Amino acid sequence: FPEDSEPISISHGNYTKQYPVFVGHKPGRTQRHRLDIQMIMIMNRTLYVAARDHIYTVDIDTSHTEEIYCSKKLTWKSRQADVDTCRMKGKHKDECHNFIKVLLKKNDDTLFVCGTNAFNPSCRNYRVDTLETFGDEFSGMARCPYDAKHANIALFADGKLYSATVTDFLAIDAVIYRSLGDSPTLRTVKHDSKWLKEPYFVQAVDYGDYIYFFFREIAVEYNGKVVFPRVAQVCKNDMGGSQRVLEKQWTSFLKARLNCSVPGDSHFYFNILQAVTDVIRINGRDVVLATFSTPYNSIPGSAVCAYDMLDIANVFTGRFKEQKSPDSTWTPVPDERVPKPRPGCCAGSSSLEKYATSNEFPDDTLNFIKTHPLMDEAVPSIINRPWFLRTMVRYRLTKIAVDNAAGPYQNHTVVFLGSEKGIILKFLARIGSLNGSLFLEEMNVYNPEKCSYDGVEDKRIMGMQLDRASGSLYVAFSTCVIKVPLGRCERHGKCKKTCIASRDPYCGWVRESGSCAHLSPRLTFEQDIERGNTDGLGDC
Amino acid sequence: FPEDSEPISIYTKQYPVFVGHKPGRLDIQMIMIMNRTLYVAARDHIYTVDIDTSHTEEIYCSKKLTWKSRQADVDTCRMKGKHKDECHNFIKVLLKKNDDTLFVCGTNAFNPSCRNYRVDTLETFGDEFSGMARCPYDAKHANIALFADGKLYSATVTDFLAIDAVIYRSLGDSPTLRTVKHDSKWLKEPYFVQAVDYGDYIYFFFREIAVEYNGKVVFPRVAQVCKNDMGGSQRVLEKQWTSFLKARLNCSVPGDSHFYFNILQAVTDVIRINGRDVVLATFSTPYNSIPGSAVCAYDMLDIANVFTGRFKEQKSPDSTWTPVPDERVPKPRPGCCAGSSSLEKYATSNEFPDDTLNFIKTHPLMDEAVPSIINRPWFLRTMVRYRLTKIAVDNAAGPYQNHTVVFLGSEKGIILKFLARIGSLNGSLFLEEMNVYNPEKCSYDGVEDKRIMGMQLDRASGSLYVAFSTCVIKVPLGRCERHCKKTCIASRDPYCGWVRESGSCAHEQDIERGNTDGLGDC
Numbered sequence A: 001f002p003e004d005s006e007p008i009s010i011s012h013g014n015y016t017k018q019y020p021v022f023v024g025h026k027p028g029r030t031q032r033h034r035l036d037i038q039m040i041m042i043m044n045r046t047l048y049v050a051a052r053d054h055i056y057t058v059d060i061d062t063s064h065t066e067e068i069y070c071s072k073k074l075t076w077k078s079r080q081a082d083v084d085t086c087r088m089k090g091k092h093k094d095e096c097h098n099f100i101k102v103l104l105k106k107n108d109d110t111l112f113v114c115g116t117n118a119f120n121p122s123c124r125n126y127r128v129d130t131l132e133t134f135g136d137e138f139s140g141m142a143r144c145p146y147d148a149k150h151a152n153i154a155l156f157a158d159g160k161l162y163s164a165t166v167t168d169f170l171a172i173d174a175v176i177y178r179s180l181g182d183s184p185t186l187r188t189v190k191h192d193s194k195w196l197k198e199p200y201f202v203q204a205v206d207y208g209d210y211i212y213f214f215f216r217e218i219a220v221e222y223n224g225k226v227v228f229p230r231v232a233q234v235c236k237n238d239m240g241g242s243q244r245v246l247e248k249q250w251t252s253f254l255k256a257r258l259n260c261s262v263p264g265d266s267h268f269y270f271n272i273l274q275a276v277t278d279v280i281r282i283n284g285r286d287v288v289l290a291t292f293s294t295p296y297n298s299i300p301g302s303a304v305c306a307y308d309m310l311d312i313a314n315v316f317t318g319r320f321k322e323q324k325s326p327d328s329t330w331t332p333v334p335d336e337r338v339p340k341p342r343p344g345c346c347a348g349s350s351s352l353e354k355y356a357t358s359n360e361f362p363d364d365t366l367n368f369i370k371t372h373p374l375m376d377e378a379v380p381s382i383i384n385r386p387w388f389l390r391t392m393v394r395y396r397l398t399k400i401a402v403d404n405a406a407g408p409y410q411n412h413t414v415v416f417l418g419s420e421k422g423i424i425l426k427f428l429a430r431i432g433s434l435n436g437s438l439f440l441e442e443m444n445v446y447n448p449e450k451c452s453y454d455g456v457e458d459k460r461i462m463g464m465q466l467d468r469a470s471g472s473l474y475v476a477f478s479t480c481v482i483k484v485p486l487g488r489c490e491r492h493g494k495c496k497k498t499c500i501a502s503r504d505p506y507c508g509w510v511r512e513s514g515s516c517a518h519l520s521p522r523l524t525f526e527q528d529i530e531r532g533n534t535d536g537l538g539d540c
Numbered sequence B: 001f002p003e004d005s006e007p008i009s010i011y012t013k014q015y016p017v018f019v020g021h022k023p024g025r026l027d028i029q030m031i032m033i034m035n036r037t038l039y040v041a042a043r044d045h046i047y048t049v050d051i052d053t054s055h056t057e058e059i060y061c062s063k064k065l066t067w068k069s070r071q072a073d074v075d076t077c078r079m080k081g082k083h084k085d086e087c088h089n090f091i092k093v094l095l096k097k098n099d100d101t102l103f104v105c106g107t108n109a110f111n112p113s114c115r116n117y118r119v120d121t122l123e124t125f126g127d128e129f130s131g132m133a134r135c136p137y138d139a140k141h142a143n144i145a146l147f148a149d150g151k152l153y154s155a156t157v158t159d160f161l162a163i164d165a166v167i168y169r170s171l172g173d174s175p176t177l178r179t180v181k182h183d184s185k186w187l188k189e190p191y192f193v194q195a196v197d198y199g200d201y202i203y204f205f206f207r208e209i210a211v212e213y214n215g216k217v218v219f220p221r222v223a224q225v226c227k228n229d230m231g232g233s234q235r236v237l238e239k240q241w242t243s244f245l246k247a248r249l250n251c252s253v254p255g256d257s258h259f260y261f262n263i264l265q266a267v268t269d270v271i272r273i274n275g276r277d278v279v280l281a282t283f284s285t286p287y288n289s290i291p292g293s294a295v296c297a298y299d300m301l302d303i304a305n306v307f308t309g310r311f312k313e314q315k316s317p318d319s320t321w322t323p324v325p326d327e328r329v330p331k332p333r334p335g336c337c338a339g340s341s342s343l344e345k346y347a348t349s350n351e352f353p354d355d356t357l358n359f360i361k362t363h364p365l366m367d368e369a370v371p372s373i374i375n376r377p378w379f380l381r382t383m384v385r386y387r388l389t390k391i392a393v394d395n396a397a398g399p400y401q402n403h404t405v406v407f408l409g410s411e412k413g414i415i416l417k418f419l420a421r422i423g424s425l426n427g428s429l430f431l432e433e434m435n436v437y438n439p440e441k442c443s444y445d446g447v448e449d450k451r452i453m454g455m456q457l458d459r460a461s462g463s464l465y466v467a468f469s470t471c472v473i474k475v476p477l478g479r480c481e482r483h484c485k486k487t488c489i490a491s492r493d494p495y496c497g498w499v500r501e502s503g504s505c506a507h508e509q510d511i512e513r514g515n516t517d518g519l520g521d522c
């Protein structure tokens, strides 16, 4: 098994503590209450911070102070009647508030916002410019969790809202769901373990004709109790089943195990999926990066694997899985036993042109996909081994941010990894004839002085947002958001050797000033990212 | 998942080393102390060291036994495609018999052979014996060999191609018996670790590919055979074991979901520790997995016990394995020795009825796993690239000889020393971590092979002998002088104590507490 690589550089709290921090204050002048940040996102030039009872915004381009100030504040507190109801059902005072868990750009003028609303999930439209709501409230059931601690997915595609959460207060009825967009609402088959077995929802992406969902669940291929990572497709144009079969349910839902393994005399799999990026074009290919850990009761380890959207689409064209008899191993269904038209193919697809919508699909096709949602094959990662590995630390790798246009010629790919302990890992994607990774830097960004207050010291990174124009990576914790500089250039000061050795696409040696500097689009800008060559230099 | 322990204590170039010189590379395979002699088994040779006369910085050999392969065997070895380095006689078996000879087996250039030698002169005694099934062909392979009541128990491969792994018995004026050839239910690519003699049985410790968990998953196993097994009947298991049964060994961290350590590394001989007969064993995770090692302890009663439970079975092909209902196990019950409790009617296994014989041939595996002593690992190590392998135990350590100290070797020449806590075996206290590889005296042509080949703890000389491929190292059981009264007491090390008559720490103490009440500070 692969040894842990060492980073070229390390940054401790001593240096990082000078990074600007947002803690929810407007500019007008010591009251401190934990923010309960849930997620962050950048739209246009505005950073949105979704939290308890609020969404704060920071205008990125005009924020230069050491304390990052809130620019506009959206306020949405639960009605007292809902708070009281929440408490009577036995929930605690801290959790019976409105935690914002869905925040989406519906269009240029409109935000779609959903909050737990004291275990009575609710959604609203908000004006982008005034952050005031307009129109009727929308039901939140199946669109937004009740409990802020739960993981959930929401995404718009073509006006339709795709969501994944639980429909019920008791958190028993986990669902992948679609609504809005003037199309029928669709859901996964309630209480059906072949469709979903205690899923934990991680990510969805919109690609080609499909929405793909990433998640983990108890694996039926193991009937003692093992969690597998999954990706699933649904057709964007799905209209539900016929009056006889899968009425009001998906007719295109299929899923496959994700393969993130280390090759050996018996493969070792990373099964506990932590995060997945949006689709990123890296080196001609369309790809997602995904972080995995070993089970929490196991010896701790983490990995990043990459997946080509092409390999993902391809797994759904292969054989389906089945149990020929109860309590037997799972085998591939022979294609001769697969109905026509093929389950999981979209109406109007090649050879399905006869079908106006999935409502016209034959019963054999529908009963089949209802009883065979799982594919035989697992999706292979690019390179068939993890791009990055950590095995000798106590923390797990979690969030991911990617810059596929780093450097003078915008042709390096830099990947940032967050962790449950506030450490960020920075690495360079090896490319070409994508060949793994180079560990550039490790850095502790958690700032106890600004982030540890109101009885909270929670170093779990909740989100990371990379922003090129401000040369920053925004790193969210529960109680704060930190503005992290993309490259620690001037660190190396006037030492040319450590500047060149860093192999950091964000940094170069500028002899006109005699110093290591960040890209300034001008003077000479020397770097050697491909090789680390410092022969004839030194030292420090 | 549990975090690692730091030792209470973490220079080792001044230790006496043996490199095979008389006064004025060895490819060591094993060491063992017999009476007052340390035997060093190696390539083409066996070396002896007088334990109680060696005090120089270099340990010298007293007598040397030489047994090189005949040239004809070397040349045949090469012609079969083996390399120059492997085509020698590597000594892999070395046992003291009751008639006072040494029984020695060597790979003999891929043509395993055995011989008796005189203990006094180390000269051959009588004719060579066949080595097939008694000793491996390949020096890199792990093998078991043990005498009990004159019968020789051995585990290895019988064939040049190493396809036919076997647990075998011969000699002792008793039938030769073997495991059923090519029968995966019996053995499935086993890796042999240790055997012990206990009660009416010999117990074999080993690892193999698990039939119950069919992706290739390796499980650790303990198997029994009856010392008095005479083989099957004329029509069932005629020349095979009639008592072979095995069971998974359980070494896991407690919780709702258990994490198992599966790759068995080593097992001690049976050891008495406060009224109980136990073995300690080291395990690691598979080699391409996240690295980790564990020590689990086992009571011989719990091992005896699994063999009385329900057997495992596949009620139908490719199904999950389930326990057989006791209503279905024949009489006599499979695996109980002839002459036993309910088996007085049976003189030898040759009389067992076809029905129980057919059943045991088909059901060598028990449903249940042997639990460890507190149902949890005695010790855990996970933050490191090495794995825990060899084990040596001193169950009568200290002035009052009432302390149990455990030493663990590793594949990287690091040794770990523990006190065994005793509950009202309540775990372990991490006393010390020491690197003892002497690169100066042990390296050879630039290369440093830091794998520990064997450890032998010797109370009488206060030493732990640690064997590497190239040297054996004489390690002080207690590094008392290293530690100042406070430091000394707090070490809680049973071999070390404070003597104010020298104002020093030497071979006053509180081992049960680091009690530094009113002392210090250094």
Ligand SMILES: *[C@@H]1O[C@H](CO)[C@@H](O[C@@H]2O[C@H](CO)[C@@H](O[C@@H]3O[C@H](CO[C@H]4O[C@H](CO)[C@@H](O)[C@H](O)[C@@H]4O)[C@@H](O)[C@H](O[C@H]4O[C@H](CO)[C@@H](O)[C@H](O)[C@@H]4O)[C@@H]3O)[C@H](O)[C@H]2NC(C)=O)[C@H](O)[C@H]1NC(C)=O
Residues within 6 Å of the ligand: B421, B422, B423, B424, B426, B427
């Ligand atoms: C297996 O081995 C372990 C130790 O290696 C034993 O575990 C401890 O057992 C002792 C005996 O009861 C416990 O001692 C108690 O310590 C308390 C202080 O807190 C301890 O435990 C916490 C976590 O629970 C740790 O964070 C902390 O560091 C301490 O270790 C004291 O408050 C207690 O003292 C009080 O009671 C005594 C009489 O009982 C009075 O005389 C005192 O004045 C005082 O009022 C007590 O001494 C200890 O808590 C146990 N746990 C641990 C982890 O230390 C197992 O018992 C042992 N199993 C056996 C013996 O079979």
Ligand SMILES: *[C@@H]1O[C@H](CO)[C@@H](O[C@@H]2O[C@H](CO)[C@@H](O)[C@H](O)[C@H]2NC(C)=O)[C@H](O)[C@H]1NC(C)=O
Residues within 6 Å of the ligand: A259, A260, A261, A263, A267, A377, A378, A380, A381, A384, A385
């Ligand atoms: C997980 O992905 C790996 C990497 O492709 C697969 O490994 C292959 O497995 C077969 C034997 O099982 C070999 O013949 C190939 O050579 C392996 N590696 C390569 C380089 O492709 C593995 O099988 C996958 N696991 C699952 C469950 O699909």
Ligand SMILES: *[C@@H]1O[C@H](CO)[C@@H](O[C@@H]2O[C@H](CO)[C@@H](O)[C@H](O)[C@H]2NC(C)=O)[C@H](O)[C@H]1NC(C)=O
Residues within 6 Å of the ligand: A409, A411, A412, A431
């Ligand atoms: C990144 O972009 C630059 C474009 O200038 C590439 O650098 C040049 O690569 C060419 C070959 O295509 C070399 O012959 C030149 O000497 C390079 N110019 C420089 C910077 O000195 C670079 O190869 C690209 N790196 C990638 C794709 O990883």
Ligand SMILES: *[C@@H]1O[C@H](CO)[C@@H](O[C@@H]2O[C@H](CO)[C@@H](O)[C@H](O)[C@H]2NC(C)=O)[C@H](O)[C@H]1NC(C)=O
Residues within 6 Å of the ligand: B034, B035, B036, B100
């Ligand atoms: C040293 O050698 C002698 C014989 O040469 C071993 O013989 C033991 O003798 C006693 C008394 O006759 C028996 O009860 C034991 O069964 C013999 N060995 C054992 C313990 O099984 C003796 O064991 C050897 N060991 C030492 C250190 O004396």
Ligand SMILES: *[C@@H]1O[C@H](CO)[C@@H](O[C@@H]2O[C@H](CO)[C@@H](O)[C@H](O)[C@H]2NC(C)=O)[C@H](O)[C@H]1NC(C)=O
Residues within 6 Å of the ligand: B250, B251, B252, B254, B258, B368, B369, B371, B372, B375, B376
């Ligand atoms: C290995 O040993 C452990 C510890 O004895 C066993 O763990 C018990 O398992 C049962 C069923 O899963 C639990 O309900 C108990 O609470 C566990 N601990 C104890 C002792 O109460 C475990 O089952 C063993 N594994 C195997 C395969 O036998």
Ligand SMILES: *[C@@H]1O[C@H](CO)[C@@H](O)[C@H](O)[C@H]1NC(C)=O
Residues within 6 Å of the ligand: A044, A045, A108
């Ligand atoms: C986005 O912001 C920019 C300036 O930050 C502004 O010029 C532009 O009009 C905005 N576009 C919108 C509102 O989508």
Ligand SMILES: *[C@@H]1O[C@H](CO)[C@@H](O)[C@H](O)[C@H]1NC(C)=O
Residues within 6 Å of the ligand: B400, B402, B403
């Ligand atoms: C060891 O012996 C001493 C005195 O003989 C005693 O005080 C101590 O409790 C003993 N330690 C044990 C039994 O573990």
